Amino acid sequence: ANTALTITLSTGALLFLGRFVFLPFQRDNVSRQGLPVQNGVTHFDAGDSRAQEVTSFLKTNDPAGFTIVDVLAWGALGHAVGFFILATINN
Amino acid sequence: VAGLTPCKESKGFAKRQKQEIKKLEGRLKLYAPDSAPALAINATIEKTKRRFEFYGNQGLLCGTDGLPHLIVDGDQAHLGEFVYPGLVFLYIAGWIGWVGRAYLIDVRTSKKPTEKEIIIDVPLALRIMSKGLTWPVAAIGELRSGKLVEKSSNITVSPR
Amino acid sequence: IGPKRGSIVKVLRRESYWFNDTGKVVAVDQAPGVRYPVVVRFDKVNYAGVSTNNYSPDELEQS
Amino acid sequence: EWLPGNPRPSYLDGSAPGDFGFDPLGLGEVPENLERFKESELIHARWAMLAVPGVLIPEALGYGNWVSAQKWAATPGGQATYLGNPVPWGNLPVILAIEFLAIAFAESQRNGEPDPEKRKYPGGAFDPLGFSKGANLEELKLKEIKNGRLALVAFLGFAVQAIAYPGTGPLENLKTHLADPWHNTIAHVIIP
Amino acid sequence: WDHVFLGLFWMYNAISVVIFHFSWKMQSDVWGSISDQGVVTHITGGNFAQSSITINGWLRDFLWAQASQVIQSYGSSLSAYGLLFLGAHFVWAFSLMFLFSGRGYWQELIESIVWAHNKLKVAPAIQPRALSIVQGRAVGVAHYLLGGIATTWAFFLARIISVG
Amino acid sequence: SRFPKFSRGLSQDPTTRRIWFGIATAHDFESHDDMTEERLYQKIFASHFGQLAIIFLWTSGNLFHVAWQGNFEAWGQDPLHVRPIAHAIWDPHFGQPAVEAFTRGGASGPVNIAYSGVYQWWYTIGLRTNQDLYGGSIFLLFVSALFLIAGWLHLQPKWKPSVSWFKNAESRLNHHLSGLFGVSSLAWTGHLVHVAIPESRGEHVRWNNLLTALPHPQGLGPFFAGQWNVYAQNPDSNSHLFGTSEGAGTAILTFLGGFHPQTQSLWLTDMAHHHLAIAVIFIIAGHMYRTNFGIGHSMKEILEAHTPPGGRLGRGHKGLYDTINNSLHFQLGLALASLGVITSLVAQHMYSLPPYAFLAQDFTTQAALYTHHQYIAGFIMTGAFAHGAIFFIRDYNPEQNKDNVLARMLEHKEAIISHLSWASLFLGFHTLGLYVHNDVMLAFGTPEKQILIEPVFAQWIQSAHGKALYGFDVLLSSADSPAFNAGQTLWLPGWLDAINNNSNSLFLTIGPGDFLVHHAIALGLHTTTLILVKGALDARGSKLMPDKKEFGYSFPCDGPGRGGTCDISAWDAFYLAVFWMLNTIGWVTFYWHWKHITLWQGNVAQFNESSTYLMGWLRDYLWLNSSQLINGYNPFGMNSLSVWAWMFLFGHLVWATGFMFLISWRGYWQELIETLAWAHERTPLANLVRWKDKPVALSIVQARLVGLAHFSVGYIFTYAAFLIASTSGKFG
Numbered sequence A: 001a002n003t004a005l006t007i008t009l010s011t012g013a014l015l016f017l018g019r020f021v022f023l024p025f026q027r028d029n030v031s032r033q034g035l036p037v038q039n040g041v042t043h044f045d046a047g048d049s050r051a052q053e054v055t056s057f058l059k060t061n062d063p064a065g066f067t068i069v070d071v072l073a074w075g076a077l078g079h080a081v082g083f084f085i086l087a088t089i090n091n
Numbered sequence B: 001v002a003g004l005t006p007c008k009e010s011k012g013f014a015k016r017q018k019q020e021i022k023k024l025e026g027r028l029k030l031y032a033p034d035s036a037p038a039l040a041i042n043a044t045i046e047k048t049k050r051r052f053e054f055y056g057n058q059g060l061l062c063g064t065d066g067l068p069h070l071i072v073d074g075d076q077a078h079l080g081e082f083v084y085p086g087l088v089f090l091y092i093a094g095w096i097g098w099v100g101r102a103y104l105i106d107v108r109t110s111k112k113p114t115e116k117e118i119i120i121d122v123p124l125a126l127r128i129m130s131k132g133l134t135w136p137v138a139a140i141g142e143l144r145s146g147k148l149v150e151k152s153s154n155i156t157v158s159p160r
Numbered sequence C: 001i002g003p004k005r006g007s008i009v010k011v012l013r014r015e016s017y018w019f020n021d022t023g024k025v026v027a028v029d030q031a032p033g034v035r036y037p038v039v040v041r042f043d044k045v046n047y048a049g050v051s052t053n054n055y056s057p058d059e060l061e062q063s
Numbered sequence D: 001e002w003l004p005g006n007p008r009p010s011y012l013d014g015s016a017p018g019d020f021g022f023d024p025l026g027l028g029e030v031p032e033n034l035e036r037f038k039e040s041e042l043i044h045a046r047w048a049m050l051a052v053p054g055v056l057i058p059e060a061l062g063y064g065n066w067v068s069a070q071k072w073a074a075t076p077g078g079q080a081t082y083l084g085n086p087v088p089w090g091n092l093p094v095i096l097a098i099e100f101l102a103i104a105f106a107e108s109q110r111n112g113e114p115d116p117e118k119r120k121y122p123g124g125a126f127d128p129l130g131f132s133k134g135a136n137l138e139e140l141k142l143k144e145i146k147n148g149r150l151a152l153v154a155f156l157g158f159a160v161q162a163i164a165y166p167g168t169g170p171l172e173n174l175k176t177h178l179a180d181p182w183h184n185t186i187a188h189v190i191i192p
Numbered sequence E: 001w002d003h004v005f006l007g008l009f010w011m012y013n014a015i016s017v018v019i020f021h022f023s024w025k026m027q028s029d030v031w032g033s034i035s036d037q038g039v040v041t042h043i044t045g046g047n048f049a050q051s052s053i054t055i056n057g058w059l060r061d062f063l064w065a066q067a068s069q070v071i072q073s074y075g076s077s078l079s080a081y082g083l084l085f086l087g088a089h090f091v092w093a094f095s096l097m098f099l100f101s102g103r104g105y106w107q108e109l110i111e112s113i114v115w116a117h118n119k120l121k122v123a124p125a126i127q128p129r130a131l132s133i134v135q136g137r138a139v140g141v142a143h144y145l146l147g148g149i150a151t152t153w154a155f156f157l158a159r160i161i162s163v164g
Numbered sequence F: 001s002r003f004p005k006f007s008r009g010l011s012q013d014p015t016t017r018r019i020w021f022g023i024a025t026a027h028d029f030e031s032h033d034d035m036t037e038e039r040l041y042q043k044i045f046a047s048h049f050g051q052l053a054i055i056f057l058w059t060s061g062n063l064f065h066v067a068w069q070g071n072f073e074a075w076g077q078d079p080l081h082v083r084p085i086a087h088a089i090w091d092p093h094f095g096q097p098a099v100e101a102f103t104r105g106g107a108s109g110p111v112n113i114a115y116s117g118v119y120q121w122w123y124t125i126g127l128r129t130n131q132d133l134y135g136g137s138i139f140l141l142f143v144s145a146l147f148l149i150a151g152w153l154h155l156q157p158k159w160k161p162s163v164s165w166f167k168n169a170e171s172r173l174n175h176h177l178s179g180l181f182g183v184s185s186l187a188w189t190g191h192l193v194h195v196a197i198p199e200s201r202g203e204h205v206r207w208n209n210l211l212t213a214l215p216h217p218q219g220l221g222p223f224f225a226g227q228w229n230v231y232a233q234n235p236d237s238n239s240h241l242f243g244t245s246e247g248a249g250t251a252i253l254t255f256l257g258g259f260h261p262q263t264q265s266l267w268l269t270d271m272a273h274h275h276l277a278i279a280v281i282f283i284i285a286g287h288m289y290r291t292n293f294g295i296g297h298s299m300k301e302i303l304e305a306h307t308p309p310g311g312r313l314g315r316g317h318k319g320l321y322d323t324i325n326n327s328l329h330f331q332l333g334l335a336l337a338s339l340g341v342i343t344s345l346v347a348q349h350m351y352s353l354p355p356y357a358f359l360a361q362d363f364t365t366q367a368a369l370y371t372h373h374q375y376i377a378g379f380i381m382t383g384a385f386a387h388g389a390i391f392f393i394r395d396y397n398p399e400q401n402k403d404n405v406l407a408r409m410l411e412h413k414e415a416i417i418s419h420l421s422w423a424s425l426f427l428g429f430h431t432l433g434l435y436v437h438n439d440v441m442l443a444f445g446t447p448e449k450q451i452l453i454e455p456v457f458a459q460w461i462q463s464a465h466g467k468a469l470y471g472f473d474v475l476l477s478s479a480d481s482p483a484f485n486a487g488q489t490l491w492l493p494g495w496l497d498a499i500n501n502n503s504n505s506l507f508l509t510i511g512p513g514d515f516l517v518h519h520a521i522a523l524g525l526h527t528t529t530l531i532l533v534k535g536a537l538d539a540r541g542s543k544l545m546p547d548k549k550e551f552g553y554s555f556p557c558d559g560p561g562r563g564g565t566c567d568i569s570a571w572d573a574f575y576l577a578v579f580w581m582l583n584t585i586g587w588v589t590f591y592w593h594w595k596h597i598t599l600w601q602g603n604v605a606q607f608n609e610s611s612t613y614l615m616g617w618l619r620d621y622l623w624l625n626s627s628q629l630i631n632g633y634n635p636f637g638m639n640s641l642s643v644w645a646w647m648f649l650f651g652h653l654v655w656a657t658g659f660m661f662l663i664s665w666r667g668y669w670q671e672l673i674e675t676l677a678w679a680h681e682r683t684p685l686a687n688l689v690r691w692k693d694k695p696v697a698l699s700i701v702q703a704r705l706v707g708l709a710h711f712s713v714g715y716i717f718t719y720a721a722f723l724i725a726s727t728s729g730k731f732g
C-alpha cells in the first residue's frame, strides 16, 4: 500500500541520482557519444529537418544543466522502480 | 538413466529374443535335421543367442521398444558404448591422418612430387605407417614445436 | 632490375593463383617500360594449366 | 616471483606493489586495460576485507552465517534482525533504495578522480591516522594486496562452500573440518 | 556429347515406361493362376484397363500397390532388394547433386578445403580440382541411370518374386 | 524506350529475354539506369506501402470469405465436430460427384475446408459472428486503402522524404520499439483484456459497449494504486468452458502458465499479461537511442567504442554503422535473418504451446501451420544469406570496413567455409551411416543390432523443464532446486501439468529416431549454412575468379576456361542452397508430421521403432499415410481428398519439370529454337505471322531460376497435398 509515498520517494530517489550522482556520468556520455552521425555528418546536417535537436525545449535554468528531458527520463525510471516496488509489496 | 530399463531385466528385449528364434525355428521345419542348410540356421540361432546374452551382460539400456539404447553423454556405467570405442576409433583415425600427412611431407621434398601420389612409394609408406602408432605424442609434439600448423603468410589465400 | 635470376620469391599479387606461394624466377626483362618483367616459374599449375606468369618487382619479395 | 626462475613479462617489472608476475593468460597485456585492473584488484580486495569480518564475526557471535541472515528479504516478513535486534527501517525497498543512493554516491565520487594514483590510494580524508604520511609507504601497499588477495581467496571459498554445502556457513565448514579433517575435504565436492 | 547425355535420360524415361507397361500389363492381364473349371485369377485382376489410363493409377495401383513387397521385405530373404531400393534412391538423389550443380562452386569449395589442408601442411602436390563440366554431367547421368535402374530392378525383383 | 523502361540495356534486346528479365529485374531498383539515392528510397518506401496494402487486402478477403461463404457461427457453436470452411467453390469443370463430395461442414454447395487456422485465431481473439468478420474486412479494406493513399502521397514531391530521413536509424528504432512493438502490444493487451477475455467468459463486448463493459470488478483503481495482484486474483478455473460464463473468473492478467484444460491452449489472461510485459519492455527499450532531445545513444559511437583492446576482433565494430546505414542489403539481410529465426520460433511455439482455442485438436491445421512457417522461414533465412552476398558485391566497401569484424570475416573466410564443410561432412557420414546401419539391421532380421542413441542432452533439458519421464531429477523435476521452489507457487502448477501430459505436443518424449533426425536437421542447417556462407564470403572473388564483384551478383558463369566456371556466382550458391533448405525443411516437417501423426492416433511406438531407419520413413510414413491420398480419386469414384490427390500428382509434374531446366542446359534448346524459327519462317500460311521478340532459349541464370522455382512449387505442392490429405482424411 501507500501509493502516494512509495511513488514519490522512488521518483525522488532517481531524480536525486539524476541531478547529483549520475549527472556528470550522463553529461560526459552525451558529449562523448554526441549527436547521432551518418557518414560523417549529423542527420540534421545531412538534410533531415525532423532530426533537428530542439533547444527551446532543452533550454534549462538549472545550474548543472539538468533539463526537462532529464526530468522525463530519470523520473520515468523512478516510476518504473516505484511501480516495481508497489507490485512487489502488494503480493 | 533416461527412463531406460537394463536389457537383462527388460521384458521387451526378452520378447525379441523369443520371436527371433521362433522365426528361425519355423525356417528349420522345412529342412532335414542333418542337412547342410539346416546347419546354417542352427548356427544362426546360436549366433542370435550369443548376441542377446552379450547385450544383457554389458549393462545395455533397453527402452519400451525392447531395443538397446546407447548413452553417449560419458556415463561411468556406459563407457563402452561411445567413449571407449570412440577413443579406439580416434586413435585409428588419427593413425590414418598422421601417416597420410607425414607421407605428403616426405614426397613434397622429392624430384617429382606428383608421381609419388599416383604411385605410392611403399617402402616410404610402410616405414611411416609403423610410425603412426605413436601419433598423439607426435601431433601435439608438432603442435607445441609449431611444425603442425603453417603460418598464414605462406598459405594461399583467395582475395577479398 | 628484379631481385635475382634463379631466386625464390613470394607473390604479393592478390588476384594470382600463386599468392603467398614459393616461386622460382627464370627471367627478368631489363628493357625499360615493361610493367611486369620478372618471369616466375611455379611447381604447381593453375586452373589454366600453366605455371609461367609475369609479375612486377613490387609484387614480389625474397623468401 | 610467483614462480622462481620464471621470466617476468615486460609489462610487469616489479615496481608495482604485489607485482609477482602472475599473468599466464596475458589479461593485463594491454596498457590501458592494465591500469583499470590495478584499481579493480584493490576495490575488490577492500570489499573482500570488509566481508571476511562481516561473515565470521556474525557467525562467531551466534547470529547465523552470511546466508541465513540474508534470506529474510525473500520472505515477506523477516524484520531484519541486526545483532539480535530487529531494526525498524529494515524493509527490502527501504534498505535497497538507500544502498542504491549511498553507495552510488560513493562510487560516483570515487570514479571522478582524474589521477590514476589517487584512484588507487586517495589519502587525505580516507587516511585520518596519518600512516600514509609516514616512514613506511611501499610495504604497507604490499601489505594491502597480500591481505587483500587472501580475503579475495577467502570470499571465493566462502561462496563455493555455500554452493557445495547449502544451509551451512564458513565457520560451520570450519567446525565440520576441525572434527575429522581427513574425511571431510574438497574431495567430498570433487568426488560425490 | 551433351545430346548423348540428355538422350540417356530420355532412354531412362522411354525404357522405364516400357518395362512399367510390361510389368503392369502382364501382371494384370497375363500372369496369375488357374483354379478348377478354367477360372484365371491374375496378380492385379483387371486393373490395367481402368487404372493405367491415369497417372494416379500408375502411382497408386502400380507404384504403391506393387511396392508393398519391396518395403516390407525387411527381415526376410528379399530384404537386400529393400536395401538396394533405398540405396538406389540414394544414388539417384546423389545424381541430382552432380546434375544440378556446376564446376566453379565446387572448385571454390575445394579451394577452402585446400586452405584447411595448407593450414595443417597436408596439401597434396596433385592439386585437388573439381570435376569437369563434361565429367560432372557424366557422373550425374551415371548415378541417375544407376540409381533409377537399380530402383526399378529392386522393385521388380522384390514384387514379382514375392507374388510369383 | 521499350519495356523494360528502368534498364536501357534490356530495351535494346531484340529477343524474348527482354520480356523475361524485365519481370525479374523489376524490383532490383538499385541496378536501374539513371537511378539515384532519393528515387531508390522513395520507390522502396512506396513499395513497402503497396506490400502493406496487399497484406491487408489479403486478410480482408480471407475474412470476407469466412464471413460470407464460411460457417464461422456454426464452428463457434461446436469447434470439435465442424470443419472450418475457407470459401465456396465455383468450378465449371465439376461433375455431380465433385459437387456432392466437396460439400462439407453443412454448407449449401461445394466448399473448401480451411486449414489455415483462421477460425481458431478469430475465435480466441473475440470474433464470434459473421458480421464481426465482415466489419473487420471492411475496416482492413479501409486500412489498405489508407496505406495506398500514403504510398501515393510519399511519391508526390511535396511529401517526398529525403535519404537523411530514411537513414535516420536512431529515430526509426525508437519509434519502432516504442510504437510498432510497444504501443501495438499494449493496444493488443487492451483488446485481449477488453474483448477477448470477456468473450471467452461469455460477455459480448463490442464498440457500442466498450465504455460501459468494465473488464475487471474494480477497473483502473488497483492499477494506479499499485496493487496489481487484484488483476490476478480470481483466474479461470479448470471447469471453465470456453466462450461460456460458467466456471469463469474475473482476473484479466494471470500468470498461470500451461494450458486451458478444455481447449489444450494458452490462457487469454496469460497472453494478455504476456503482451503487457512485451509492451512495457518494448516502450522502455524504445527510449534508448538519441533522436531530438539530447539524451539517448548514438549507435555509431556504440559500435566505435565496442573494440576489444587485445586486437582479437581487430578494430571491432568501427565503421559498421555507416556500413549498415548505407547498405540496404545489409539491413534487409539482418531483417530476414531475424525474421527467419522468429518465423521458426513461431513454428516451434504454436504446436507445443498452442495459442488459439481448439487449435490443438485440429490436427491437419496444426500440421499446415508448422510447415507454413518452416518453409517461409527457410526462404526468408536463405534470402538473408543471399542479401549478405549482394551486400558483399554491390555494397561492401573494404576501405570503410578496415580491419573490423566484417572485414575479418573475409580475412578468415576459408576457415569458416572449411569448418562448416567439416561439420556438414561429420553430420552427413554419421547420420547416413547410422540410418543405413539401422536399415541393414532391420533388413538382416536383427532390430537389436541398431546403434540407437538416446538423446540424453535434450532429454536432460526436458527434465530440466519438468519432465519426470526420464528421471534425471536435477531442476524443476526435483523439489530440492531453488528454481523449482521459486517457480512452484508462481507458474509451475500450470506448466508441470501441461508438460507431464502425454497427449499434447509440449516437449514430446524423444528417442533414438529423434536423435538421428536431429542430426539430419543439423546436417541440413549446416550444409545450407555452408553453401550460403560460401556464397556470401566468396561473393567478391575467389582463387578461381578474383573479380566476381565486377561481374555483378547474378552472373551465369565465367566460361569453360580455367577448368570450368559453372555456378561460380553467389546467386548460384543461393540457388544450390534452395535445394538444401527444401531438403532441410522436408526433413524437419517429415519428422514433425510423423512424430505427430503417430502421437495423434496414439501409437507412438510406431515412430519409436520405425524412425531410426529409412525404410520405416519410406514405408510407415511416406507409403502408409499416402493410402487415402492417392485413392482420392479412383476408377470407382472420387472422394473429398481428390483435389489433394491431383495437387500431389501436380507437384510431381512441376518438380520433375524443373529437372528439365536443371539438367538440360541452354545451347541444346537454342539450336532447337533455331530449327523452330526456320520452321516457322518457311511454313506456308504461318510465315505471314511474325515475331517481334526473337525466339531464344532461356538464359543460364533464368534457367537455374525457372528450374529452382519449378522444383520449389512442386516440392511445396507435393507436401502440401500429402500433408493435408494424410492428416485430414485420417483425422488422428
Ligand code: CLA
Binding pocket: F044, F045, F048, F049, F052, F165, F166, F168, F169, F171, F172, F175, F176, F178, F179, F180, F181, F184
Ligand atoms: C511510433 C511511430 C511509428 C510507427 C507505428 C511505425 C510504423 C511502421 N513503419 Mg515507421 N518510422 C517512424 C515512425 C513510425 N513507424 C519514424 C519516426 C521513422 C523515421 C526514421 C520511420 C521510418 C520508417 C521507414 C523508412 C519505414 C518504416 C516502415 C514502417 C512499417 C513497418 C513495416 C510493417 O508494417 O511491419 C509491421 C511490423 C510489425 C507490426 C511488428 C511485428 C514484429 C514481428 C515481426 C512480429 C511479432 C508479432 C506477432 C508475433 C504476430 C502475431 C500476429 C499474427 C496473429 C497474425 C510500420 C507501418 C516501413 C514501411 O513498411 O513503410 C510503409 C518503411 O519503409 N518507417
Ligand SMILES: CC1=C(/C=C/C(C)=C/C=C/C(C)=C/C=C/C=C(C)/C=C/C=C(C)/C=C/C2=C(C)CCCC2(C)C)C(C)(C)CCC1
Binding pocket: A011, A015, A071, A072, A073, A074, A075, A076, A079, A080, A081, A083, F280
Ligand atoms: C527541488 C527543487 C526544485 C523542484 C523540483 C521538483 C519539484 C521536481 C519534481 C519532479 C517530478 C514531479 C518529476 C516527475 C516525473 C515523472 C515522470 C517522468 C513519470 C513518468 C512515468 C512513467 C513513464 C511510468 C511508466 C509506466 C507506466 C505508464 C505504466 C506501466 C508501468 C510504468 C511504471 C513503466 C526547483 C525546480 C524548484 C528548483 C529548486 C530545487
Ligand SMILES: CC1=C(/C=C/C(C)=C/C=C/C(C)=C/C=C/C=C(C)/C=C/C=C(C)/C=C/C2=C(C)CCCC2(C)C)C(C)(C)CCC1
Binding pocket: F329, F330, F332, F333, F334, F337, F338, F341, F381, F384, F385, F387, F388, F389, F391, F536
Ligand atoms: C553474410 C552476411 C550477413 C548475413 C548473415 C546471416 C544471415 C547470419 C545468420 C545468423 C543467424 C541467423 C544467427 C542466429 C543466432 C541466434 C542465436 C545465437 C541465438 C542464441 C540464443 C541464446 C544464446 C539464448 C539464450 C537462452 C537459451 C539458449 C535457453 C534459455 C533461455 C536463454 C534466453 C537464456 C549480413 C546480412 C549480416 C550482411 C553481411 C554478410
Ligand SMILES: CC1=C(C/C=C(\C)CCC[C@H](C)CCC[C@H](C)CCCC(C)C)C(=O)c2ccccc2C1=O
Binding pocket: E097, E098, E099, E101, E102, E103, E106, E107, E129, E130, E131, E132, E133, E135, E136, E137
Ligand atoms: C560434388 C561435385 C563435385 C566434386 C567432386 C569430387 C571432388 C569428386 C570426389 C571423388 C572422391 C570422393 C575423392 C577422391 C578419393 C581418392 C581416391 C582418395 C580416397 C579417399 C577415400 C575415398 C577412401 C564436382 O566437381 C562437380 C562438378 C560439376 C558439377 C557437379 C559437381 C559436384 O556435384
Ligand code: SF4
Binding pocket: E102, E133, F556, F557, F558, F559, F560, F564, F565, F566, F567, F665, F700
Ligand atoms: S555456358 Fe554453361 S557449360 Fe559453358 S561455362 Fe557457362 S555454365 Fe558452364
